[PDB]
Each structure stands twice: as structure tokens, then as C-alpha cells.
A paper describes a structure:
To better understand the precise mechanism by which AcrIIC2Nme inhibits Cas9 activity, we determined its crystal structure to a resolution of 2.5 Å using single-wavelength anomalous diffraction (SAD). Consistent with these previous observations, AcrIIC2Nme shares no sequence or structural similarity with previously characterized anti-CRISPR proteins. We also created a mutant lacking the final 12 amino acids (Δ112–123), which were not resolved in one of the apo crystal structures. The crystal structure of AcrIIC2Nme revealed a highly negatively charged surface that binds to the positively charged bridge helix. Mutation of this electronegative surface decreases the affinity of AcrIIC2Nme for Cas9, resulting in loss of anti-CRISPR activity. To determine if the interactions between AcrIIC2Nme and the bridge helix of Nme1Cas9 are required and sufficient for anti-CRISPR inhibitory activity, we mutated 19 residues distributed widely across the surface of AcrIIC2Nme. Mutation of three of the four amino acids that make direct contacts with the bridge helix (E17A, E24A, D108A) displayed a complete lack of anti-CRISPR activity in vivo while the other mutants showed changes in activity of less than 10-fold. Circular dichroism spectroscopy of the three mutants with abrogated in vivo activity revealed spectra similar to the wild type protein, showing that the lack of activity was not due to a folding defect. In addition, cooperative thermal denaturation curves and melting temperatures similar to the wild type protein indicated that these mutants maintained stable, folded structures. We conclude that the negatively charged surface of AcrIIC2Nme and the positively charged Nme1Cas9 bridge helix comprise a critical interaction interface that is required for anti-CRISPR activity.
Numbering used by the authors:
A (entry chain A), D (entry chain A): 5 to 113
B (entry chain B), C (entry chain B): 4 to 49, 52 to 111
Write the structure that this text describes.
Amino acid sequence: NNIFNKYPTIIHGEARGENDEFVVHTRYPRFLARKSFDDNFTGEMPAKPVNGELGQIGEPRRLAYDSRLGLWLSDFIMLDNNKPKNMEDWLGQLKAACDRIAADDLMLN
Amino acid sequence: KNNIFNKYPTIIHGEARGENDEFVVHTRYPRFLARKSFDDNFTGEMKPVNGELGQIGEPRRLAYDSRLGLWLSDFIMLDNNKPKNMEDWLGQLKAACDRIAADDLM
Amino acid sequence: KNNIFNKYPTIIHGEARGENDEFVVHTRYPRFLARKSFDDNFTGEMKPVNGELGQIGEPRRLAYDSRLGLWLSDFIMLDNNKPKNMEDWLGQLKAACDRIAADDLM
Amino acid sequence: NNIFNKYPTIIHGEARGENDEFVVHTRYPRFLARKSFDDNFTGEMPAKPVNGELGQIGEPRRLAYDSRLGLWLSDFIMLDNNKPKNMEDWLGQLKAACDRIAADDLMLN
């Protein structure tokens, strides 16, 4: 409810005995995601704002965000109850949140 | 969402830019998001953790006191299961807090 | 069941053969079944009711103290709505108890 | 859960400014019902054990128990979550509970 807005928008996460990291987005659309990094990740801010892409990968096909910078978000768990009135609209907002989270992780110093 | 949480580690310790407090997600029952807070004189070394749930202060909110310097508050429940029996429900919420408290002393 | 409760009066005061304590059903949010208990020196005449929720005694259970002689305990929640925000949830549970307390002084 | 079994099996209810009464059954099958009385109700124990009947009445058709003694139970709200494996089996157990509640109301003195 209002209660999520007591929290910061982006929470960056970590668990013991785990190499992947974690993120919580507390504004709409709200979610818990797994944050991972591949070989093309270096951690530095790119010249142009983060412009990732979000799509289905793996078998079975599950939604994934690729920052195109080596940072991935995956295993999304939606924390709101709502059915999006428009899927493309909802996908667009999820991606914007994801770009913001990716950019936030790089500024995390 | 009932079981998707099980792909996640039980306890996720979190942080946020510009914030002093910390954050936890508990991904087993009962699942929740909470704020991690700390006393000034919080040592961190180690009887097993026996905290307690309570409504503290005059802000009228539910907090958890580890009694070892760590607090959990602003509890957001994430499960979809209705708990009729409150008996399990606060006890298990306090039991999970005692685990988050131990796991964070590290 | 989400709304069928609305065909019922908000507060149902109950009794049972062979039992000293009494019983209440609250049929609006938050909906619950509870046990009504009484101090020995409970007068019953009448500031509006401002009780408090608490975990009392060493039995580790959630009770409500009207502070006017009436208690509610053994809370069984009956709603099907998940309350993420605990902030409303205990406050409203305590607000409903303050109403059951006033309504039973009669 | 176990928590219902802290309560007595049958709770007889009343509300302010209401003429109908109310009942909670705390054993399986668990429910909240409205308890009403018609003109053939006198309140005394009949010679043979209560043998009511349970059926659909009104428009729309909603489940009702008639004690055949003037006591009715209606507006059932089921308090358990389960789907009965067998409807006739479940109906049978609901009626037995209802006979027991009816008989309990008469002994309530």
C-alpha cells in the first residue's frame, strides 16, 4: 500500500553463500528480481543512459531483463496484485524500472 | 507467487543508496520485506537469539527487537496464504526474525 | 465469502453451554472469531474505549485488553484478503476490539 | 487449524437490534449460520432426537436447514477452505452438525 513507499525505491541485495545478487523495486511496478552479471560486465557507467531490453529466454521461456551492459535481472516476482490494463504499457514500465535499477547498481559504490 | 519465492535464498540482506538503515527479504513462510535498524552500541559477536515482537514507541507500529542491537520493522507481508490461527503466525514471524538476526551478525 | 459476511450484523455476541467465557464474531474487516473474557471487578457502565493489543502472559498469545474489564483472545481471522501493510492491520483489529468492547457493556 | 478446537463446538449468537439469532459450529464442517424461529417453534425437547432436513429454498436457491421443530439455520458461511471430496458425504455431515446445533439450542436454558 502506502507502506512500500516508506522504503527506498531500489534495494540492492545479497545473500550468504550465494554469488548472484538481488534487487527489490518498491515503486510500481513492484518486484523482487535476481541480479546477475556476465563476462561483459565491468561495472562502469556508460556514456549514454542505460537502455536495456526485456524479453523471454531459457526453457521454459521466462522473462529476463538484459541491461546490455553485462547486468541481468531475472526470476521476476511481481509484488503488486493488479492485472495490467495493457501489457505493452506494463512491459514498458517494467523496462524503465529495470534501466533505473541497472543504473543504480553502477552508482552503488 | 505461492512457490516462486522458493527459487530464492531464504534470507536476502539488502542496502540502498543514501540510506543508513538496511533491509531484509524473508523468502520462506512467513514471507516479508522488513527494515533492518541498529542501536549505537551493537557489538555483533553472538545463548541463541531470542528476540521479541512488540508494538513499540508511540508511532503505533509493529517492531522486532533482537535484544542484540538489531531491529526489524515496517513489515510487509508477501505471502498469499490467509493465516486463520494467529498462534503460529506471530510466533513464526518472530522465529524468522530470530534467524535474520543471527544471519546478519556475520 | 468475501462479502457474504455483509448479510450479518457487524458484531455478534455469543455464548456456549457449560462455558464461563463468551464469544464474539466481527463480520466486517477485519473479520474474526474471538473469545470474550472478564476481570472479576468489571463494572460495565462506560472517555471512549481505548484498549490495546498485546502479547500477554507467558502463554505467548495475542490478547486485547479493553482496560475496562473485557478481554478478547484466541483470535481467528476469517477474511480472505492478504494484508501486506501491517500498519492498518493491527490498528484496525484494535479499532474493532474497541467497538466490540463498547457494544458489550450493554 | 487446531485453533478452532480451543473454542466450544457450538456457539449460540445474538446481536443488538436484531431479532434473529446466530450460531457458529467450530468442528468440521465449520460454519457461521443465521438461526431463526417460526410459529411452530415452542422451544421444548421433542420425544425423538432432532431429525431435521437440509435443502435449497428461496429465490435464488440458497441452502437452508429446517429442524422440523420451528428452528431454522440459513445463510451458511463455510469456515473451512476444503472442497468436499463427496457432496452427499459433506451434506450428510452438515445435517448432523445442524441437528446437534438445533438440539443444543433447546438445551440452552
